[PDB]
PDB file of C-alpha atoms and ligand atoms in Angstrom:
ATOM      1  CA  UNK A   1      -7.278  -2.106  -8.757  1.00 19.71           C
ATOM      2  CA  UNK A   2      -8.279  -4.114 -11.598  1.00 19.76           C
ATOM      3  CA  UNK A   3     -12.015  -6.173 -10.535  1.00 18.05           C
ATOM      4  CA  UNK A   4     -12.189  -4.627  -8.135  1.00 16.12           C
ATOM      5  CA  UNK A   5     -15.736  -2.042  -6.713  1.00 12.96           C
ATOM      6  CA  UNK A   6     -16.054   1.387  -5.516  1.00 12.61           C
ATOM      7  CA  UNK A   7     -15.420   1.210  -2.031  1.00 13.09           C
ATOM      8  CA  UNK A   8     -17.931   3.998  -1.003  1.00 10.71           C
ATOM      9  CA  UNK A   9     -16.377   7.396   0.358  1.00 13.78           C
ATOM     10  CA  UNK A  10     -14.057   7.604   3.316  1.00 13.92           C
ATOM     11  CA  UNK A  11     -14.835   3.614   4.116  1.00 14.24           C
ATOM     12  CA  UNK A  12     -11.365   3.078   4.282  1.00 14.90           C
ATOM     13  CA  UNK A  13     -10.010   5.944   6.719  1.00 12.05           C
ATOM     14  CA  UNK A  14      -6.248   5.098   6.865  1.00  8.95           C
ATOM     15  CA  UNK A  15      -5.524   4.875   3.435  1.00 13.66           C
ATOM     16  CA  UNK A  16      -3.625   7.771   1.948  1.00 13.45           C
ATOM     17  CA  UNK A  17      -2.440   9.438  -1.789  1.00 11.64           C
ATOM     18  CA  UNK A  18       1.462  10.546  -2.011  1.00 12.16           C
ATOM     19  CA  UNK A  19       0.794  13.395  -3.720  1.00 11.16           C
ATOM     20  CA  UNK A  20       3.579  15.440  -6.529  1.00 15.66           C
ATOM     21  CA  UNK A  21       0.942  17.386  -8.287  1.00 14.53           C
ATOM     22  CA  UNK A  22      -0.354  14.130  -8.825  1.00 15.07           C
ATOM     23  CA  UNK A  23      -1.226  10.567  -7.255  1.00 15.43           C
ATOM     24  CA  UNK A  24       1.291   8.502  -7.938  1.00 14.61           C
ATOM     25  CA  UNK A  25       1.524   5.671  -4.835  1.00 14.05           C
ATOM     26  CA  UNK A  26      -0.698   4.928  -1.664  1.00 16.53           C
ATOM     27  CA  UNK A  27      -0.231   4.645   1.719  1.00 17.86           C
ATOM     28  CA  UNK A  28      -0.991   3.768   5.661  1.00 17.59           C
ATOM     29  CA  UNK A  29      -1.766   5.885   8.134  1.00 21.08           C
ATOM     30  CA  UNK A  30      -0.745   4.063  11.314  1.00 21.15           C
ATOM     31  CA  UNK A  31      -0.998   7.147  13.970  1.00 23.31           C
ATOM     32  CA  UNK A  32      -1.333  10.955  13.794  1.00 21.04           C
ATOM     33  CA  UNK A  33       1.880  11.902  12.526  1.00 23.77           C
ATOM     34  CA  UNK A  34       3.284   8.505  10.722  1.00 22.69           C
ATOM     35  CA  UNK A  35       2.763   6.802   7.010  1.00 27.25           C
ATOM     36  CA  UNK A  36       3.539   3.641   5.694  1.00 31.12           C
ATOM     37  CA  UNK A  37       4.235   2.596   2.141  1.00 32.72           C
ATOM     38  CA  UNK A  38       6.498   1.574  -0.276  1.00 30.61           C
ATOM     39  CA  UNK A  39      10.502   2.275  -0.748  1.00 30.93           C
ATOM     40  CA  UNK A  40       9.900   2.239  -4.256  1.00 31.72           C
ATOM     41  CA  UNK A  41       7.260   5.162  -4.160  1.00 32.28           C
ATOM     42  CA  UNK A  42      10.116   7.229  -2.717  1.00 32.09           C
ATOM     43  CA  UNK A  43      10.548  10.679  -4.029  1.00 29.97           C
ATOM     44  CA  UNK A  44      11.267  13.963  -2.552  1.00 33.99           C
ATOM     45  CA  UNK A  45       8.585  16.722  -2.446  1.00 32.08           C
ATOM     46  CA  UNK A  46       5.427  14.545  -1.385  1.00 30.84           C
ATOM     47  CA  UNK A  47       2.489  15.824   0.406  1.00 29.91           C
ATOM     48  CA  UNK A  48       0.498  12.974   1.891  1.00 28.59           C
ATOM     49  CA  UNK A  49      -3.735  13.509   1.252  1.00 29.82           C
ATOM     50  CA  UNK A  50      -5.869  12.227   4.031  1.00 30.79           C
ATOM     51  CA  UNK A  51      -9.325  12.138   3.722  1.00 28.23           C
ATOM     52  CA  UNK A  52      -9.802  11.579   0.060  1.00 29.71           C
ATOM     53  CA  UNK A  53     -12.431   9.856  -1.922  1.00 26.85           C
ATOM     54  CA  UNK A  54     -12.352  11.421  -5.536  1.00 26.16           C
ATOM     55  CA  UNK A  55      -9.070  12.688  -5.600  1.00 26.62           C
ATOM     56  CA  UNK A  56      -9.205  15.346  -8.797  1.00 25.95           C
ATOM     57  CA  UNK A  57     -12.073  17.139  -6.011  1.00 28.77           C
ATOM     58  CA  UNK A  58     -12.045  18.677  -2.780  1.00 24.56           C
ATOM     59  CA  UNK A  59     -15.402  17.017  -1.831  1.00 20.74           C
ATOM     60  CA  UNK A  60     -14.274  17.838   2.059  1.00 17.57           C
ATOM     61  CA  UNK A  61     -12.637  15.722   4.889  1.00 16.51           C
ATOM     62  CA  UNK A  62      -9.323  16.315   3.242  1.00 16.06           C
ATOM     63  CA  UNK A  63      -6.375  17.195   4.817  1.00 11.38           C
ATOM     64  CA  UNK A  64      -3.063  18.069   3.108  1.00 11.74           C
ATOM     65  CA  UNK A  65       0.035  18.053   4.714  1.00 10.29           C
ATOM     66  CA  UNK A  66       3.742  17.886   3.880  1.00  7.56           C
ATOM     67  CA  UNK A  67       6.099  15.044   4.402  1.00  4.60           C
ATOM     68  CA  UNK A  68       8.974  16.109   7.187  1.00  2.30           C
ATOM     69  CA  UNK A  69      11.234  13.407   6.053  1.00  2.00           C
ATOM     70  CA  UNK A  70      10.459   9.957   3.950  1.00  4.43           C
ATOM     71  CA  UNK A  71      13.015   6.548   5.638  1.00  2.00           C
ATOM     72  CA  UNK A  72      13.260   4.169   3.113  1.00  2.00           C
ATOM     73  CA  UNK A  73      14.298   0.788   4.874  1.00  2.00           C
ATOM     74  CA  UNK A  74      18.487   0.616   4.864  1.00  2.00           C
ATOM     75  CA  UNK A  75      18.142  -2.874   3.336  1.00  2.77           C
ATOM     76  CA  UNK A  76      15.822  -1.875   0.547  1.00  3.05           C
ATOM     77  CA  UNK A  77      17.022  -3.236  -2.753  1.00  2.00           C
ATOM     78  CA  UNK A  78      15.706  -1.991  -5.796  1.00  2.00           C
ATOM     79  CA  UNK A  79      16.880  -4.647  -7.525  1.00  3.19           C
ATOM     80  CA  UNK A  80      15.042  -7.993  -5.901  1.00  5.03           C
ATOM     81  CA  UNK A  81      12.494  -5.231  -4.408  1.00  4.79           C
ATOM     82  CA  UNK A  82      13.394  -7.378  -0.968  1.00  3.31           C
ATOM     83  CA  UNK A  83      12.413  -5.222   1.983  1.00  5.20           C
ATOM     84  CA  UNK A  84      10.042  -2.518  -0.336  1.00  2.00           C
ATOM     85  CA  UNK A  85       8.903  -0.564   2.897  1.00  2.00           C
ATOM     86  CA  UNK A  86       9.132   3.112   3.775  1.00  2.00           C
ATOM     87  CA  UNK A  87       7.676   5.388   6.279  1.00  2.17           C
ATOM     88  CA  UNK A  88       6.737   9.144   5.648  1.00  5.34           C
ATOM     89  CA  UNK A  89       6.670  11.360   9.272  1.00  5.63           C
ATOM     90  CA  UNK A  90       3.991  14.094   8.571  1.00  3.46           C
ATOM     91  CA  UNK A  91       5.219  18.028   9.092  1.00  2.00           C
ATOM     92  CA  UNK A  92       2.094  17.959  11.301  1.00  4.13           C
ATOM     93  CA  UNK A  93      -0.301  15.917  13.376  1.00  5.79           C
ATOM     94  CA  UNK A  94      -3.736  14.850  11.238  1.00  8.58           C
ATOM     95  CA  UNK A  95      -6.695  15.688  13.174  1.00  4.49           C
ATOM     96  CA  UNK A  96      -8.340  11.710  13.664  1.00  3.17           C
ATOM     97  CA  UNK A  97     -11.748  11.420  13.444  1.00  5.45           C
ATOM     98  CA  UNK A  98     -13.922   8.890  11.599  1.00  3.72           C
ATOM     99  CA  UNK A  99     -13.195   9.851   8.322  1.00  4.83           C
ATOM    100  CA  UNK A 100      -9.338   9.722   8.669  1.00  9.85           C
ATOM    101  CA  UNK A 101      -7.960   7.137  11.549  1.00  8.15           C
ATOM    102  CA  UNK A 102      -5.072   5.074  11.833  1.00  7.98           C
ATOM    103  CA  UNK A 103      -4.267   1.086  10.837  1.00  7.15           C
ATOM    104  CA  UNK A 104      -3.195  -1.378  13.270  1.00  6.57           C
ATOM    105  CA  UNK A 105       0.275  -3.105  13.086  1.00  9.33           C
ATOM    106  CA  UNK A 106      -0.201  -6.787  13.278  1.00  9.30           C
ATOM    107  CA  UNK A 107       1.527  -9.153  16.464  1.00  6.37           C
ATOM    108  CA  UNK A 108       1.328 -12.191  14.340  1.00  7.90           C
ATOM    109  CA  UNK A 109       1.342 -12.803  10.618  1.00  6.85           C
ATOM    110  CA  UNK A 110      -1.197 -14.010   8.824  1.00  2.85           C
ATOM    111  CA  UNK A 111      -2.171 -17.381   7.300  1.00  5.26           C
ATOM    112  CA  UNK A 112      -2.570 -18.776   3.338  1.00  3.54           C
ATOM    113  CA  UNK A 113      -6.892 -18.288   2.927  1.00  2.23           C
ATOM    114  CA  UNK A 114      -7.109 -15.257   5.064  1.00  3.62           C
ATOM    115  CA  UNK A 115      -9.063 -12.724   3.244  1.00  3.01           C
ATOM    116  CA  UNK A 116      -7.806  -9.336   2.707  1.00  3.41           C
ATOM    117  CA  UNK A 117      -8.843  -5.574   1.690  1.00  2.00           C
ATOM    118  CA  UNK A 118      -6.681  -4.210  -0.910  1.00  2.00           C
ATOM    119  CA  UNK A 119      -7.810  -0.371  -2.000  1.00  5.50           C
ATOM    120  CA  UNK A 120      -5.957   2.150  -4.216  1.00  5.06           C
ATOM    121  CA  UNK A 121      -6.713   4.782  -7.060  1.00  5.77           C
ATOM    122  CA  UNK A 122      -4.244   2.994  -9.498  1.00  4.36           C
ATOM    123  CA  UNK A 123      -4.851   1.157 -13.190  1.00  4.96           C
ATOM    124  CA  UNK A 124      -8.361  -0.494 -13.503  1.00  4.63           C
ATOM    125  CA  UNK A 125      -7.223  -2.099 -16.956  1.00  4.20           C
ATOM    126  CA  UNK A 126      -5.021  -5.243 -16.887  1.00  3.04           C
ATOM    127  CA  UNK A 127      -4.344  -4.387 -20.754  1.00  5.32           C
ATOM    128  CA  UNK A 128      -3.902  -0.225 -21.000  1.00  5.30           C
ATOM    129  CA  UNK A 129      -4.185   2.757 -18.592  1.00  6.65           C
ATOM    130  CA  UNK A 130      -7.609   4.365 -16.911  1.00  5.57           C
ATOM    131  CA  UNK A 131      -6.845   5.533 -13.658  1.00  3.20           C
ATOM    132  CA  UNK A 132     -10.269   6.103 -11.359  1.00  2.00           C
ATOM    133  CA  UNK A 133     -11.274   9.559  -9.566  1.00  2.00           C
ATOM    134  CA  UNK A 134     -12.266   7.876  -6.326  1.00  2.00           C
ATOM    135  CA  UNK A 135     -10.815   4.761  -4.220  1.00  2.00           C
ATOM    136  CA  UNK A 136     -11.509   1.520  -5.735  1.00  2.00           C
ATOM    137  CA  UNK A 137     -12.093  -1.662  -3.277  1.00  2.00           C
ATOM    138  CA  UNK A 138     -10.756  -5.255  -3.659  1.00  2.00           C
ATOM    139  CA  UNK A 139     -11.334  -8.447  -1.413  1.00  2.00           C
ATOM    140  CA  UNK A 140      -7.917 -11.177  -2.155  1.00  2.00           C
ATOM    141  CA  UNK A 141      -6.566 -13.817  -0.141  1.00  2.00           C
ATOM    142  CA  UNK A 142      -3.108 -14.487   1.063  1.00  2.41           C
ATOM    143  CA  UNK A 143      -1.973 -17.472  -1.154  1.00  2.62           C
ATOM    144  CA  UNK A 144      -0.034 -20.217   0.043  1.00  2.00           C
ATOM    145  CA  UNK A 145       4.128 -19.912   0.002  1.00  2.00           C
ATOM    146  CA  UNK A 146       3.958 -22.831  -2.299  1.00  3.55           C
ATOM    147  CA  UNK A 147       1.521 -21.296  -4.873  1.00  5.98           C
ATOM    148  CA  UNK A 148       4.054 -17.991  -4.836  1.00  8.77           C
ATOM    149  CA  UNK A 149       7.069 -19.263  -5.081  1.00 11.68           C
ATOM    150  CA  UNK A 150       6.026 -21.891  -8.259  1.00 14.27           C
ATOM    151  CA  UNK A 151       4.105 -17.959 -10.055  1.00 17.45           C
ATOM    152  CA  UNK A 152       7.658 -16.295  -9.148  1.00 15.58           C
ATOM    153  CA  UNK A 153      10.426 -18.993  -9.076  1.00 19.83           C
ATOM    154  CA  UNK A 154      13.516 -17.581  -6.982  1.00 18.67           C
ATOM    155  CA  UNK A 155      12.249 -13.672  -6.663  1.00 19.08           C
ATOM    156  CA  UNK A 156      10.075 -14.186  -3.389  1.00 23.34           C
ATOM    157  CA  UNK A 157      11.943 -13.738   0.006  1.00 23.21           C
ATOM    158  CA  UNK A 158      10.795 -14.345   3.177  1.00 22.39           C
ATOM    159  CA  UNK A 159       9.810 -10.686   3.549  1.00 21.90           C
ATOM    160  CA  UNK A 160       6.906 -11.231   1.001  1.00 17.60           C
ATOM    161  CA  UNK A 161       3.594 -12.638  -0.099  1.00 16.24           C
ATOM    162  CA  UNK A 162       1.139 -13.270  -2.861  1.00 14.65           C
ATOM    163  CA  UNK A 163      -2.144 -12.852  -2.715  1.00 13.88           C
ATOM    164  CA  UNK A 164      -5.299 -12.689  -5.179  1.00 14.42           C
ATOM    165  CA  UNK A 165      -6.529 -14.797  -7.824  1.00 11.24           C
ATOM    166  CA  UNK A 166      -4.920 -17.294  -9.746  1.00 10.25           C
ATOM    167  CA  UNK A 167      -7.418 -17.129 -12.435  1.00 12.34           C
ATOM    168  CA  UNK A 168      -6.574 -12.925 -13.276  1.00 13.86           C
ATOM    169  CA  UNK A 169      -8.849 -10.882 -13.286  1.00 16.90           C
ATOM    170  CA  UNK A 170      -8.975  -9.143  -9.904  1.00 15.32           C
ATOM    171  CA  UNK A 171      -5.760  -7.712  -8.893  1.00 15.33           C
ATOM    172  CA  UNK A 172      -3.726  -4.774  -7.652  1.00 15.08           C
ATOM    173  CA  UNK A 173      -1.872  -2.395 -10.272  1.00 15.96           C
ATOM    174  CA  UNK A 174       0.496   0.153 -10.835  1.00 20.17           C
ATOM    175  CA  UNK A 175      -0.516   3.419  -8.714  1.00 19.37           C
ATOM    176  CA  UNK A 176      -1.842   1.124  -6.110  1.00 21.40           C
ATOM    177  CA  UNK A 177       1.669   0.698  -4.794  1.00 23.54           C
ATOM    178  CA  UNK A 178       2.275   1.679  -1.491  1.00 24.99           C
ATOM    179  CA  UNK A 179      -1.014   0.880  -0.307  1.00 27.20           C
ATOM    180  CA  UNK A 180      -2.275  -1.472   2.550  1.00 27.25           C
ATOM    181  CA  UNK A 181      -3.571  -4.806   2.339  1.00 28.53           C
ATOM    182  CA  UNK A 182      -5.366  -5.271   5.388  1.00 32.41           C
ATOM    183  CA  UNK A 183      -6.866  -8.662   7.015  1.00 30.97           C
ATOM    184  CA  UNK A 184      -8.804  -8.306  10.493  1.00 30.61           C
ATOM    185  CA  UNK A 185      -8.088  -5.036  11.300  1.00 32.60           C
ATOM    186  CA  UNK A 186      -4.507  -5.586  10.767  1.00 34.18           C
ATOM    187  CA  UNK A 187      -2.132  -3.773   7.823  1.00 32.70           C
ATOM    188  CA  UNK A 188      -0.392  -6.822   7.024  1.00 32.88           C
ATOM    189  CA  UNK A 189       0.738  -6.230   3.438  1.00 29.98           C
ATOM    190  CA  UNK A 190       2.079  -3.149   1.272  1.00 24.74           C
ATOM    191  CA  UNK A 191       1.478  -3.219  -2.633  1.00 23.25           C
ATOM    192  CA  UNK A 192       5.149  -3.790  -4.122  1.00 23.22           C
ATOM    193  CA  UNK A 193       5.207  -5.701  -7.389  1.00 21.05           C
ATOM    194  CA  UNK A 194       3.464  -8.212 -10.122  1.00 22.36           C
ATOM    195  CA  UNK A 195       3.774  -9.483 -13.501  1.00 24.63           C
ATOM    196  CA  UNK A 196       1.377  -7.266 -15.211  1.00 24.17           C
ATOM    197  CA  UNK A 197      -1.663  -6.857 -13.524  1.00 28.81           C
ATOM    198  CA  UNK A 198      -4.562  -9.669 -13.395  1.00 24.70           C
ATOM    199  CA  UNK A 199      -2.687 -11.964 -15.159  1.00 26.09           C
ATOM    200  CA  UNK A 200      -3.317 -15.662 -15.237  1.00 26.95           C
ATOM    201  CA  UNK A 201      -0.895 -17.240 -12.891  1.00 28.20           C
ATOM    202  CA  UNK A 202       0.901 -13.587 -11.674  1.00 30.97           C
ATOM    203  CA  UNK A 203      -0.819 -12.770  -8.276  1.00 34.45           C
ATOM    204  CA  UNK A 204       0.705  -9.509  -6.893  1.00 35.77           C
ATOM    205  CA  UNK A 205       3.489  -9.377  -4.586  1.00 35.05           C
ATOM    206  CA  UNK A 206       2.956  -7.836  -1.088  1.00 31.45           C
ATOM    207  CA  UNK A 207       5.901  -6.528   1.419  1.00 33.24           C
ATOM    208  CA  UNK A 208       5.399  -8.950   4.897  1.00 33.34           C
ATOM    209  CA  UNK A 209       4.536  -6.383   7.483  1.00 36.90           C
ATOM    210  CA  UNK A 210       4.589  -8.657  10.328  1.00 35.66           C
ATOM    211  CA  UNK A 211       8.574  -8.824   9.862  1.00 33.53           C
ATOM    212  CA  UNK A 212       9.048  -5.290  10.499  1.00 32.92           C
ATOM    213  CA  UNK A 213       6.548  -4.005  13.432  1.00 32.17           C
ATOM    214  CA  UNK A 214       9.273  -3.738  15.502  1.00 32.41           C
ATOM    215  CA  UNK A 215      11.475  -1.651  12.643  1.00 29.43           C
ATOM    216  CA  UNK A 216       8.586   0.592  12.554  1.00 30.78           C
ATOM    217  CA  UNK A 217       8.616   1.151  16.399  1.00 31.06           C
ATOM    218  CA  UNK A 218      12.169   1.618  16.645  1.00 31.41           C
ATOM    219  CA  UNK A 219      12.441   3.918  13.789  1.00 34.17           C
ATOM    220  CA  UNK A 220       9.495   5.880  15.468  1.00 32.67           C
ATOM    221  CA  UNK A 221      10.593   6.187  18.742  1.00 31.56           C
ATOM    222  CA  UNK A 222      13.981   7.662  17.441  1.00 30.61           C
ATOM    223  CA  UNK A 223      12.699   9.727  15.273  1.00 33.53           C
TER     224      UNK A 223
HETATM  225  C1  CR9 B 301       8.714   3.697  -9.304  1.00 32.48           C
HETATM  226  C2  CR9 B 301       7.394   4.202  -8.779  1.00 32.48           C
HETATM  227  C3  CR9 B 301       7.409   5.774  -8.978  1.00 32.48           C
HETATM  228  C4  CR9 B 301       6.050   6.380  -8.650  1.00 32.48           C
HETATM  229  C5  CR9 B 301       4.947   5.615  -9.442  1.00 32.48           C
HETATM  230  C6  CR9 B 301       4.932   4.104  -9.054  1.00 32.48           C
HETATM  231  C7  CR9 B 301       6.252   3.525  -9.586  1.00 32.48           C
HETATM  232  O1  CR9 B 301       6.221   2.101  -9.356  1.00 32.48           O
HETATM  233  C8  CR9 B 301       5.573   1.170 -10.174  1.00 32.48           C
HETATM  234  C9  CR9 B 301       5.703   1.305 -11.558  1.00 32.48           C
HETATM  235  C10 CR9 B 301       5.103   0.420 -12.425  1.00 32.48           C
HETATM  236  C11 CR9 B 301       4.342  -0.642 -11.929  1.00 32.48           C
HETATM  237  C12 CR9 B 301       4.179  -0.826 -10.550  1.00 32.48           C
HETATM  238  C13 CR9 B 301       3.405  -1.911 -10.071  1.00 32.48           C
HETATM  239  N1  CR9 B 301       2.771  -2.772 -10.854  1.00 32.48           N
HETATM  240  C14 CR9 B 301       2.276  -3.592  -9.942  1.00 32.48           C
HETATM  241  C15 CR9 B 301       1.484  -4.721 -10.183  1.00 32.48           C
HETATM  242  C16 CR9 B 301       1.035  -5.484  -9.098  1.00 32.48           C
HETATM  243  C17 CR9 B 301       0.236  -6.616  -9.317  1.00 32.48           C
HETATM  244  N2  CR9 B 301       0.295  -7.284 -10.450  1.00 32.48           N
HETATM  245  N3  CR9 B 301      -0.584  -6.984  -8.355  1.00 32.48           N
HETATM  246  C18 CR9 B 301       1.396  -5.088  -7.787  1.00 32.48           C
HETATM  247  F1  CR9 B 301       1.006  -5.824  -6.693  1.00 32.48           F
HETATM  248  C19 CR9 B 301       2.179  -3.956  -7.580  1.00 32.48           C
HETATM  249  C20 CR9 B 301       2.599  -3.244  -8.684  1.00 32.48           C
HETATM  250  N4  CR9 B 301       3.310  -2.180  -8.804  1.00 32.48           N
HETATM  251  C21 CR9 B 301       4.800   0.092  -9.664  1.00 32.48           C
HETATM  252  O2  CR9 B 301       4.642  -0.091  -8.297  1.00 32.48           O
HETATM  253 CA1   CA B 302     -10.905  14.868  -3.138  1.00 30.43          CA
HETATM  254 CL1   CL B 303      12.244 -20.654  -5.138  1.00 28.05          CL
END
């Protein structure tokens, strides 16, 4: 998160680190035994941390567990990014309490102006690398279609959205991917992609979680 503030230890209970001996995407909790994130975070091996705050610590709260099986969308294409979304079923149930809890799907989509939470452990520097120790905090807005598809001419589908700052400055960044972008109450957006990171002009790219809640509900109840 580049602009972005501290967000203050387990204030944001459903967001998760994919773990391979290191953090290298975010993530959704949105029940006990389900994940949400990216397709292109995918990678075998992952153990999903709950609970975290600085993640180089054990400061407590965390829990660790293994990923049973990762389910990359069947339309993902790695190529436009078009349909970037994933879900990771846990090995085992997380215990819930307030310091770990689960994300609500939205029944609607959002609108252009509505303001968002975006939080993640990735870049803080728009021009080199310093990754934080604990969560890092960003308010955005969802930007209008028109506004997105004039920053990224032909590359946005229907399954995406912009949202942050026009100006640079504040934005999401690499590491953050994967992680949720949440508007009243609701995990309406996953961190996908971007031109850089608080660029001028290059808000960051979000996957549309309102077009696959019912996806996610078929592809849990069968699994
Ligand atoms: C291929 C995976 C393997 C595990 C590490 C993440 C990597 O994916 C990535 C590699 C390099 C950059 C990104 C990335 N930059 C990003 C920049 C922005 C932005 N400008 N708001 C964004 F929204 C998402 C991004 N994602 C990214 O998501
Ligand atoms: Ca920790
Ligand atoms: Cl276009």
């Amino acid at each position: 998160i580049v602009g972005g503030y501290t967000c203050g230890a387990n204030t944001v209970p459903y967001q998760v680190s994919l773990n391979s001996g290191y953090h290298f995407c975010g993530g959704s909790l949105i029940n006990s035994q389900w994940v949400v994130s990216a397709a292109h975070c995918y990678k075998s091996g992952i153990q999903v941390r709950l609970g975290e705050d600085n993640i180089n610590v054990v400061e407590g709260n965390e829990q660790f567990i293994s990923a049973s099986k990762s389910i990359v969308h069947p339309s993902y294409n790695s190529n436009t990014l078009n349909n970037d979304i994933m879900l990771i079923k846990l090995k085992s149930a997380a215990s819930l309490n307030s310091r770990v809890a689960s994300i609500s799907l939205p029944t609607s989509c959002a609108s252009a102006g509505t303001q968002c939470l975006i939080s993640g452990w990735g870049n803080t520097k728009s021009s080199g690398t310093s990754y934080p120790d604990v969560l890092k905090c960003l308010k955005a807005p969802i930007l209008s279609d028109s506004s997105c598809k004039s920053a990224y001419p032909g590359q946005i589908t229907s399954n995406m959205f912009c949202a942050g700052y026009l100006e640079g400055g504040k934005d999401s960044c690499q590491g953050d991917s994967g992680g949720p972008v949440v508007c009243s109450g609701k995990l309406q957006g996953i961190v996908s992609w971007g031109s850089g990171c608080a660029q001028k002009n290059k808000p960051g790219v979000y996957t549309k979680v309102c077009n696959y809640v019912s996806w996610i509900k078929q592809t849990i109840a069968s699994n």
